[PDB]
A paper describes a structure:
The membrane-anchored [name] (soluble N-ethylmaleimide-sensitive factor acceptor protein receptor) proteins provide the energy to drive membrane fusion in various cellular contexts, such as intracellular trafficking and exocytosis. Supercomplexes of [name], α-[name], and either a syntaxin tetramer or one of two binary complexes of syntaxin—[name] reveal atomic details of [name] processing and show how sequential ATP hydrolysis drives disassembly. [name] comprises three structured domains connected by flexible linkers—the adapter N-domain followed by the D1 and D2 AAA+ domains. Six [name] protomers come together to form the active form of the enzyme, a homo-hexamer.
Numbering used by the authors:
A (entry chain A): 203 to 318
B (entry chain C): 212 to 740
C (entry chain I): 1 to 40
D (entry chain B): 212 to 638
Write the structure that this text describes.
């Protein structure tokens, strides 16, 4: 079983529903996710980790969330966990950290049950 | 089978003698006379002092010395719970076995020891402004009502240890509850010698310790070391001597041929002293290497005069009894080198405790923080038999600026008050201060506090300049002759630091222009009083 | 900011379910059946 | 099955040698001799330094070097709770197994390891009243009492990691507690060479690395890099090499003809070294294009004098021992072109740490914020064998205005104190 099928069976770029970004996507694809589509044999032989996140900045209303959801729907990933910044803070001691620590639970569990 | 030599405590003879007399003297005299006197028994002890000086050891050894039950222990806030009325259920269960052997066995019961710990976490003072919290103010009331209440217990003993004796509730320290109060402090030479013997006896027993190691030198060479740091030093030396036989290149294997000749030599002790252990109430050579950057060179007569005056002040503060506090001020023009001389005068003092209060660690502080930092340095200085403190660059400590003028008035009043406060009875203190603007200090009425004054001049003659040049050894014979011919018939006025800077500046041109550049630089740097 | 000091809790229990009598009833009934079978 | 060559660490020979000598030396010598000395075992370690230099890696590699049971972990402030008396329960729950085994077995028990993390988040100095007097002075006393109390433990080892070694308490750092303090810092040339040789071992074995790339001309071109950034550089080179084969834009497609002939070449390293990774203690090329906007045209002699004097001042701070700190002031009439020349002088010195502290990045700040910002830049300047910090337009930093006069005093005092403070020894 080779995990080269992370790429969804069928994908076009322009059909995704995003228009106006053509070098941002190119650079993101090259620098970030070029190691999630190559056959596992070569990636394993070279022994390299994967990029563990990205940052997006710009004006408000130019289509950032859309690109994040499209990135997620590209890699056959699961349902994203959308969160909001000022909705995590709380007034009691030990509540904000509890909120922040409840997002990485399923990842740890599924790492335990099926490793790699 | 108890015997003082078994306990293994050194440097605390008087404290233990007082504790024994006060607490255990009425439980060993024949019962009939103690009944005729009609006196109850003491039921408390408090120990306080700075970190690492032998408090918990004393409590443990007292616990092992008594023919009684197994003492309880309470590791800090271990009696707290989140329900209502549960934080006090665990405070009544401690005294619940001593109240049962008093009803039944009458006046033939046995001591029930209890050992609190970090007592200042659950026994802070109660407020009368109605600002209670709940974690305390109901625990304290129960504890107070249980140690000494309507019904009487005569077969308990309570021990407490803390680092901050200020915060403990007052109603809990009257002669009825915690009557004995002791402070455990740093030892003197005899205490350090006893501690070293105690910690080296075992090694010496099995011919494991070398023959050229002498303990008196180490006792003399460790000044104001606390109880724990001597043990750490010995352990580090042992670790080095033990590692000398282990190889961890590819796999770890022990050489059994050479492992039979294990021995600990004074080289290990010296290396451990240099590299590993660093005390808290002592001094380390880093400061004197960061302030005396380029040593001191005798370019003339005045240097010796300044040093001699410092010597006289040191001797006075060391021998006198009427004046346990003397202070002096060093002042002069800028760039004349008046912060190296203060450091040297302090270093040659050979006092145990030396500190340097400088405004290099207080960048961005508001005046409140500066006041508190100065107060914490002086408070630390009030716990030694001899001391020396250096207040450096006063004008930068008040935040002075010629315009306005403007400065801090809440830091100038924590200095005028701290230059006239004698230490606790029986100790000595010497304060040195350096500034470059005497007149401003004179307008603030700050020259009344200081006891005397010393003056530091600049190079003021061609002969002195040539002597300094020869001492530094930069320019050679022909250049020296040229400079002599070009400067001997004039007057000079320049500080030493600027001289070093000018020499370094002029050593960068090509070899055939250095003297001309140096003379050109020196001509512009010319002034008069 | 103002950090809440903490909190304290109160409790309110509920009736327990022993459900142990039914076992004795069942044992007794089985004995009933045994004796009834023998009598016939 | 433990040997140092497989631990995967480079550039930290001295630190690990000292840690092994002090912490694990007495647990591997034969028990008889150790018992004929009567010595306890060290009980703690502390690691601190800048971000991304190999602390957690060292802790993780120590945790699996020993034959103990699996280590505990505390991922920051995960012991805090709101209800009264629930944090100390979580603190007490860590030492239980060690206590039980010590009570039962005796002097034969195995090691138990606890690995704290971001220790400065829960252990701050006590006595800072009106700041913290609840759940932060009863979560430190419990720890102090448990590490070294009336009951004796001899089978634990504690490890702590922190970026700020000044906030931690003082009674928690004396011989008898956390007492082996190390510092992890930027590596010198040999460190960079060792890290590069560690991070390109698998590729070279399978013949995926071209013979053109040299790992001795790459350790010279990366100055003030830290380990994380060297790793990232290698990864970026690998990604740029891989993506060069995928030729598809609409739907992902993978070639196979050239996929077999896959290799990494010097071009990839050069392309990624100057376009993807940007060190944090290094130079930057954008500043010298945002300040020197129209270049330096030579309109006479007065322009070829400032540069010569700058050259002389640059050469003095590099080959001297009685003057590690220098200073200079450029002043003149307005609209005369001062900042450009300072930028040029800084640029043409070849130092490995050049920074500019300008006042157009502090619009709206107060006095204390300005103090903290300047202090932070200078603090960063003390971790590099050479440096050059530019401070332009002083009167804007002071907020001068001729009416009054009016200005800021605190910033002036900070600036006057930072101009004659020498760096650590040898820098
Ligand atoms: N007088 C002494 N003789 C021998 N050892 C001593 C002495 N004083 C201190 N020590 C050493 O101190 C070690 C522990 O010190 P101790 O428990 O007294 O610390 P403490 O200062 O009461 O604690 P803390 O500062 O953490 O609140 C003992 O194991 C012993 O090695
Ligand atoms: N005879 C000497 N007396 C004093 N300093 C000397 C002497 N010889 C060499 N030096 C060196 O000269 C420097 C003296 O500068 P110092 O730090 O004392 O300046 P300062 O008087 O405090 O100046 P500032 O006005 O900047 O506060 C130190 O490096 C000291 O080592
Ligand atoms: N000395 C080194 N040798 C080999 N690899 C290293 C070294 N230093 C860092 N790395 C690599 O870079 C990564 C840096 O992560 P690491 O856990 O060391 O960060 P850190 O110093 O704890 O970071 P921070 O505390 O700022 O979050 C290591 O996991 C390893 O991949
Ligand atoms: N020979 C030169 N020297 C300096 N700047 C030059 C020269 N030739 C062209 N320039 C350009 O002139 C401008 C120099 O102005 P600069 O930014 O230094 O102003 P300034 O002196 O800081 O001004 P102000 O005092 O008004 O704030 C820059 O664009 C620089 O590129
Ligand atoms: N590049 C784009 N092409 C088409 N529609 C876009 C684009 N960017 C934004 N939109 C429109 O904006 C809306 C979503 O904006 P949103 O992602 O919420 O902005 P932000 O991420 O800044 O909050 C969508 O309804 C979408 O139609």
């Amino acid at each position: 079983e080779n995990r080269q099928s992370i790429i969804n069976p069928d994908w076009n770029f322009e059909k995704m529903g995003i228009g106006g970004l053509d070098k941002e996507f190119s650079d993101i694809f090259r620098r970030a996710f070029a190691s999630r589509v190559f056959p596992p044999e070569i990636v394993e032989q070279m022994g390299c980790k994967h990029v563990k996140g990205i940052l997006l900045y710009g004006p408000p209303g130019c289509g950032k969330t859309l690109l994040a959801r499209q990135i997620g729907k590209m890699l056959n990933a699961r349902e994203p966990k959308v969160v909001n910044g000022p909705e995590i803070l709380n007034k009691y001691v030990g509540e904000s950290e509890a909120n922040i620590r409840k997002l990485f639970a399923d990842a740890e569990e599924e790492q335990r049950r099926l490793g790699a | 089978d108890w015997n003082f030599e078994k306990m293994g405590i050194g440097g605390l003879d008087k404290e233990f003698s007082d504790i024994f007399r006060r607490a255990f003297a009425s439980r060993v005299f024949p019962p009939e006379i103690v009944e005729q006197m009609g006196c109850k028994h003491v039921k408390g002890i408090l120990l306080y002092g700075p970190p690492g000086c032998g408090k918990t050891l004393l409590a443990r050894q007292i616990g092992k010395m008594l023919n009684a039950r197994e003492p309880k222990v309470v590791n800090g806030p271990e009696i707290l719970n989140k329900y209502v009325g549960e934080s006090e259920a665990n405070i009544r269960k401690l005294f619940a076995d001593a109240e049962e052997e008093q009803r039944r066995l009458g006046a033939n019961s046995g001591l029930h020891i209890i050992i609190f710990d970090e007592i200042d976490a659950i026994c802070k003072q109660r407020g009368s402004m109605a600002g209670s919290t709940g974690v305390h103010d109901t625990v304290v009331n129960q504890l107070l009502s249980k140690i000494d209440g309507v019904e009487q217990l005569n077969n308990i003993l309570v021990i407490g240890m803390t680092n901050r004796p200020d915060l403990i509730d007052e109603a809990l320290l009257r002669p009825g509850r915690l009557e004995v109060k002791m402070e455990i402090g740093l030892p003197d030479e005899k205490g350090r010698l006893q501690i070293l013997h105690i910690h080296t006896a075992r090694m010496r027993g099995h011919q494991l310790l070398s023959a050229d190691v002498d303990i008196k030198e180490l006792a003399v060479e460790t000044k104001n070391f606390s109880g724990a740091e001597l043990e750490g030093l010995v352990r580090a030396a042992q670790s080095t001597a033990m590692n000398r036989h282990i190889k961890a290149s590819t796999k770890v294997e022990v050489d059994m041929e050479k492992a039979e000749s294990l021995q600990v030599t004074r080289g290990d002790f010296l290396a451990s002293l240099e590299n590993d252990i660093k005390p808290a109430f002592g001094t380390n050579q880093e400061d004197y290497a960061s302030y005396i950057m380029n040593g001191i060179i005798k370019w003339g007569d005045p240097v010796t005069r300044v040093l001699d005056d410092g010597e006289l002040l040191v001797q006075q503060t060391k021998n006198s009894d009427r004046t346990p506090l003397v202070s002096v001020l060093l002042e002069g023009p800028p760039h004349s080198g008046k912060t190296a001389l203060a450091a040297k005068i302090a270093e040659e003092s050979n006092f145990p405790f030396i500190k340097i209060c400088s405004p290099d660690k207080m960048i961005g502080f508001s005046e409140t923080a500066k006041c508190q930092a100065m107060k914490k340095i002086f408070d630390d200085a009030y716990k030694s038999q001899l001391s020396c403190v250096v207040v450096d660059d006063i004008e930068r400590l008040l935040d002075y600026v010629p315009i306005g003028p403007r400065f801090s008035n809440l830091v100038l009043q924590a200095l005028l008050v701290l230059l006239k406060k004698a230490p606790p009875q029986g100790r000595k203190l010497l304060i040195i201060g350096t500034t470059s603007r005497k007149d401003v200090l004179q307008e603030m009425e700050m020259l009344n506090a200081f006891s005397t004054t010393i003056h530091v001049p600049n190079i003021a003659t061609g002969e002195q300049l040539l002597e300094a040049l020869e001492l530094l050894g930069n320019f050679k014979d022909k250049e020296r002759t040229t400079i002599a011919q070009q400067v001997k018939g004039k007057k000079v006025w320049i500080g030493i630091k600027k001289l070093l800077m000018l020499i370094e500046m002029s050593l960068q041109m090509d070899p055939e222009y250095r003297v001309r550049k140096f003379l050109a630089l020196l001509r512009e740097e010319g002034a008069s009083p | 900011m103002a950090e809440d000091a903490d909190m304290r809790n109160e409790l309110e229990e509920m009736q327990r379910r022993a459900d142990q009598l039914a076992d004795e009833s069942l044992e007794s009934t089985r004995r009933m059946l045994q004796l009834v079978e023998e009598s016939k």
